[PDB]
Symmetry: D2
């Protein structure tokens, strides 16, 4: 077997040890192996996969394979691969192309290696994606391959937005399942995963004490909520910025001061609009928005000396890192940790005190400077992923008559019953015991004893 | 010579007015609507039957509706939830209100009846504001001819919405409704953070018990269960959580709570043997938050640790089997809304008996029964939504529509997201928070308008 | 119960049955105190003791009083604050035939009269021989006005930080006439009562007084000692954004590490007396200020003028002079919202507009807010403090300082704490009250760390 | 240039270590303040310090502060797993004798201490000792008493080392005076508590990447380390139970919101398996020892633990857990450095998919230093500022030069004055941007203090 490329195949044994541990931490995913192994619902599936090549993704990969699928895999970020996980998957005879520290060109090459087998397009029929890059490449560069694919399963918030924009424009070619908006994905991954892994990555990269220092979290969606908690629980004084007043209300009620980097919240492009008094007191800024340029050049110039800057959103344009590359001198402390000297562009004084510390070059800090979300959290997201692959593959969209395809081209979610069944396995993993309604109680609140227990409008 | 009211003590009116003036400073979203709409008088001609806890916060709501042109006739939706100084102030302002703290069940229904009838005949009502559905039920059961002239119902709480949706499903709902509960500035503000503030508040006022280091069991982990669990955990209780919904149970685990069931393996078969006696014997405090029936049953009550506190913060008292306790155990009143329940028998008690439970508010809503409910700055969000919902349905004029147009409009709906955000913005500004404004490039990048809405309707926050 | 008993003064004797019901509940919440009652009742270690008592006449103090009585003592009691009495507690004590002079809402004149009613019986000095005090007021009156009574008194047992400081000043000045036990500095007192008590009761009192939402609002806590630590937690756990002021850099360090921003009301921390030294921008953002220092004028007139409109002002230290309420009485108009809640209108002295927006809310007129606007610390916390009080009373009464020759007296004139072994035994009963299980050292383990299996487990230098 | 008087894992890591030292200096304002304050005075000129403490980046800033004030040093680590190899490299590259690397054997650990004691095969002309745990102190008293004759004092970092010093003093075997650095409030109530709060969950995440929220933890001990450890886990969402032999510390755990339990039925440890609360230990996902005592996670507790539980120790010595029992009876599978699965199915071999194992971190050694980087610089700032002030005080006292009659009056184990404790604290507070208020003269008079402090009596517990 030579159909792979990883950093060091001799790490496979180490990766396999950590995969065995992770399986014990992922009861929903392993429950799917046990219950669907007999049926083999993915027998004949040929999955193109593009998501962070972590130990957790390795357990997802081997679940798909255990249920009958063939896969070809790559990472969806240059810094997120765990090299021992990629080696373990390659050593199992599974095509994977990923290592930690890829270039932008190597990242694109890796995706192309899953798409192409022996210089020709693989006969893929299913797509698993995280962020929409593989989806984007298949639509623009390989649009004929999409005629054989039954569906796409997208993992993250940003990629779902890209899916919906394509549907509005009439450019989506196959059906997709929004895995993100399962409650066991969104309200488990996006929030709780960042709570675990944000402070984790900051400690590994800098070993800075967080207690008693000032943080500014930009955004208070699910990622901003978990991020703010990750810092507040360490004893940081956390301020939150938002453009959504409802999320801002939640931040107030959660015990945070809501501030704007700009005077009266008005970002008019001038240095005068920056609240320099506020930014001159901030020790740490974290972007969580999925928007562009929310930590902009004028903010970076006003930040307190020696502040830490990082991004836990999907793309590295939340921080204006291009401005910093253009104007300031970068000193690498260690991999994925750079001191950015605001004294000038060419050279720096090794003892200069006027610098910022940038983590992971503005890329996803939890995966770049640590190991991202823990297995027991990723268990929820990835159990949803397996179910969505099963559902789309059994639908067989690519084999439908043209008129039947037009009614099937949509972006749907999984039914709440499956969402609840994933949750039940996660609860049992904690040793929790769910109570069963009596028939009278179920009638009283208007549900079935079996569930679902909430209407589809419920927000939890 | 205004006499069209009944309250405990009208001489409390000046005190109530002092607290109303303070509360107004704490309710910027509600007072903003008052200032914004006062000239337009959008509720001129509205005649609102209101049934909701006659608190100081409800007083500000009432006087906002009146300031926008409405006439109202008011009662409380719970026998223990009224603040008599608030009722006095409303009555002294010439507004018909029938409510006092400590009503009997007969007085409770008499009070609702006094809003429905004026001078012994049906009032010319055309709007309903309700909390829990009791008024709504009486109208449908006893006054269908009045509903023919009513434009809509604005319902405050989860239990009342469920009752509306049952009527809609059965085809017995006679007028459209706005689900005020499911605004985010209500459900994820009032139901959650309101109970965070007021649950431990009511327990302290009722018992003055230290909570830190003691063991609590919260039944339910919806919005109220979430806020209640945090109310106890932030005080230092060791909180365990029960749930029938595995997604809510998942949240409780991830939020750092142990999830347990009162019943072995979660199976509630009705036998004493099914009770986890070891667990129940460790619990110092049980709080029910479900909106369900009999979630703290007789066998749990028998197995509870001696001197544990029992209370309910759901809408109705049947979450606890208090009927079993009246029938079997002797009740000793410590003070109003605080009773020791002696499990030694029904015929009297030893004053020094150690085997008792403490029941708060006789199982009625504990935060309102033993304290003052949610604070003004939280009820600001709920009641701003109520005002906007009243305006919307009154302006729709459902009762004046042809039969075919009524059929197209008979529904239970929520307010649009844009209103939800505008209520939130005034709440944030009340804290002194500063929302950031998107640039045109940023708004285009994420696909929203600069003024919002900022989230799809599917967003869960 | 005694026939014709009139030797008392309370608000409303008809509250007695309610008070008794709450005393019976509190007994179940105070296992260390009730354990002493059960362990020592037969021995009657306080038979012959005649105790002058001055401490907040709460339900918790009622359990302490009746423990001392159950061990053989006679007492005459008053409260140590004009607003801290629970009237149903005083009524139940009076109904039991125990002389008590206390009600909620005393004037300063009545407060002094109440202490004098304990000191006197039938117009003449009572033959007291023990003193239990909280804050030093009774101690001071005895030294200043009735020094001859101190000749027959065996000891003083002082409850709180402020009172201990007053005792230590007297000792170093040679004006202390009897030995004392510093009950405050038992760990089961200071690090339980002073910290955890305020955590429970500060937000309790603020809620009862104002019903204000605390989540999301800005608080300034002046001081970060034991009371300031517990107060800051009381507010932070509600979701307040809490800033902390301190003069002690070590306490300030703890505040930083505990997750609080440390700030001063004065620019660069320097109070030069002028309004220009006030950090007006900081104070104009504060919704709630709480004084916790035991010091004087730590929320001064210039701070009060700079506070954000409609801010809440309160004090949880022992004496009301932490806030400059005198200045507010001189210059601003007071509007009573309800008992122990006043709006203070900064528009002027004479009248006020009922809809004026420029006011502050003062709780308990600056007196101890937790006792003034709620019920102070809960029973299970006061268990620790008052168990120490009983043991201190037993130790000093059994020592019989007043019966010693003048030479032997000067050798034992001291302010002492109880030994750590007793501190530990009180803690053990508290832990058992929660259902906690303490592990027992093996002989090899106790030898390894150099302690006895039964303790004490820590050197006297240990800070916990 | 020509410097060979060291032994580190990899000298080429020096530039990386120097980069981290420069960052750490910006995080240690109290230590760097002492450098600026005393550089001209050179108060340690002539001091020759034997140092034995974790060779971390933070210790590097301490070492160079001592050198900047005039001292010469010879350094080693006090734990086989706690060295950061880039820190040791940076120190050796600056021409400072250091013998330390991560992952030493027991024989290498003792060899390293001996390399500081001896120079060119003979006793170095040492006159000061800086110790963390008492290992270097014990070797000097047992094996080099002639060297102690010329040593002016010992400055001891940690609780376990202080207890050993007090035992020597009690038995009349302590030969030179000592300063208990541990019991400065800016050490004990900063390092021991807040440091473990930061670095405990840090080390657990690095070693296992386990989700902690919603899982069950048992902390043995509720002293300073146990307090900070319990908070480290609780703030992550763990359901933390606490064990204690001290009822006062147990009272604090209760009031702090923890359930207090014992591994033994009714807390009675009689040596039998029957005494183990198996139902309690069968629900525990993580056990952490914090006591400084022996065998507080014994063999019967280990046999009863829930399958796949994590076992770690953050007290100074590994004997808090009965790891010797596990080496004799169970098969060890290394996951990665300082992470071992202990298979409870037998001693000879294991099934790679066996589910009945425990995960042991750092082989039972200090887990925060073993599996992460110990406490962060801004916390170690306080501890090491105290160390520098303690070295200055004892070196200036010149105990070794005093007559016998005067030595007897100074042979003691003391703490630093509270005024200095406060001066360290103020620099820490200023590092956060905190602003301390200055008492007026009337306010200082009212509470009976000098305006400049000290502000508390020596009995105050904070
Ligand atoms: N690193 C990870 O492990 C991880 C996991 C999940 C999601 N993500 C990524 O994180 C991002 C956020 O995801 P989410 O689920 O929280 O989405 P979300 O929509 O729930 O939250 C984003 C929030 O940012 C706010 N926002 C937008 N522009 C802003 C601005 N200029 N200033 C302040 N706030 C602003 C929005 O109002 C919104 O509340 C996405 O890119 C997603 O792909 C990362
Ligand atoms: N007291 C107040 O101030 C206040 C405020 C808002 C709502 N409420 C009332 O509280 C109740 C709950 O409202 P909500 O918004 O939280 O609703 P919700 O639907 O969000 O939560 C109720 C939860 O109870 C759970 N549950 C049902 N039966 C159960 C059982 N047998 N055991 C355990 N868990 C069980 C459900 O799974 C659900 O998650 C309603 O009656 C509502 O009207 C009271
Ligand atoms: N209300 C209650 O229930 C209760 C309970 C116990 C004690 N107390 C009282 O509270 C007060 C404090 O007691 P404690 O045990 O916390 O004492 P403490 O000595 O432990 O704390 C007081 C703190 O105030 C700080 N301080 C002094 N002057 C200051 C100033 N100008 N600005 C800022 N900080 C300043 C000191 O540095 C000190 O840390 C005393 O009066 C005590 O009697 C009240
Ligand atoms: N890893 C680190 O970074 C670090 C930092 C400081 C100290 N330490 C070490 O940690 C240890 C503890 O230090 P400390 O300052 O917390 O000491 P401490 O004296 O404050 O606390 C130890 C506690 O353990 C308790 N204990 C003793 N035997 C017990 C048993 N069998 N079961 C349960 N509890 C028991 C004692 O009652 C005491 O409260 C020492 O070895 C110290 O040197 C480590
Ligand atoms: N550990 C992980 N594996 C895969 N995708 C992730 N996204 C966040 N954390 C992740
Ligand atoms: N204060 C309050 N007023 C009215 N309704 C409420 N529901 C909960 N708290 C309330
Ligand atoms: K991970
Ligand atoms: K209220
Ligand atoms: K009380
Ligand atoms: K470190």
């Amino acid at each position: 077997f030579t159909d792979y490329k990883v950093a060091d195949i001799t790490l496979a044994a180490w990766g396999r040890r950590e995969l065995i541990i992770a399986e014990s931490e992922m009861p929903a995913l392993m429950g799917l192996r046990r219950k669907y192994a007999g049926q083999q619902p993915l027998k004949g599936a040929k999955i193109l996969g593009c998501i962070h090549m972590t130990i957790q993704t390795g357990v997802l990969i081997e679940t798909l394979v255990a249920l009958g699928a063939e896969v070809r895999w790559s990472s969806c970020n240059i810094f997120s691969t765990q090299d021992q996980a990629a080696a373990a998957i390659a050593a199992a005879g599974i095509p994977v192309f990923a290592w930690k520290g890829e270039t932008e060109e190597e990242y694109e090459w890796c995706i192309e290696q899953t798409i192409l087998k022996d210089g020709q397009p693989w006969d893929a029929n299913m797509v698993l994606d995280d962020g929409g890059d593989l989806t984007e490449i298949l639509h623009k560069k390989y649009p004929q391959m999409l005629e054989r694919i039954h569906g796409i399963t997208e993992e993250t918030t940003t990629g779902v937005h890209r899916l919906l924009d394509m549907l509005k424009n009439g450019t989506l070619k196959v059906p997709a399942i929004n895995v993100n908006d399962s409650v066991t994905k969104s309200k488990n991954d996006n929030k709780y995963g960042c709570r675990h892994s944000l402070n984790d990555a900051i400690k590994r990269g800098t070993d800075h004490l967080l207690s008693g220092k000032q943080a500014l979290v930009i955004g208070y969606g699910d990622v901003g909520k978990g991020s703010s908690q990750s810092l507040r629980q360490e004893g940081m004084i956390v301020k939150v910025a938002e453009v959504d007043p409802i999320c801002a209300m939640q931040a107030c009620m959660d015990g945070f001061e809501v501030v704007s980097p700009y005077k009266n919240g008005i970002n008019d492009g001038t240095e005068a609009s920056i609240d320099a008094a506020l930014l001159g007191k901030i020790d740490l800024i974290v972007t969580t928005t999925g928007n562009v340029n929310v930590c902009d050049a004028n903010m970076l110039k006003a930040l307190k000396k020696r502040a830490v800057v990082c991004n836990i959103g999907h793309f590295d344009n939340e921080i204006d890192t291009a401005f910093m590359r253009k104007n300031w001198a970068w000193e690498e402390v260690k991999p994925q940790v750079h001191k950015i000297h605001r004294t000038g562009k060419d050279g720096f004084d090794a003892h200069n005190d006027d610098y910022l510390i940038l983590l992971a070059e503005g890329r996803l800090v939890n995966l770049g400077n640590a190991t991202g979300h823990p297995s027991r959290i990723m268990d929820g997201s990835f159990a949803n992923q397996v179910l969505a692959q099963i559902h789309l593959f059994e639908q067989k969209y690519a084999d439908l008559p043209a008129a039947e395809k037009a009614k099937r081209l949509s972006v749907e979610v999984l039914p709440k019953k499956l969402d609840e069944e994933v949750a039940l396995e996660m609860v049992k993993g904690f040793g929790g015991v769910v109570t069963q309604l009596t028939p009278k109680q179920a009638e009283y609140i208007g549900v079935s004893v079996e569930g679902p227990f909430k209407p589809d409008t419920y927000r939890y």
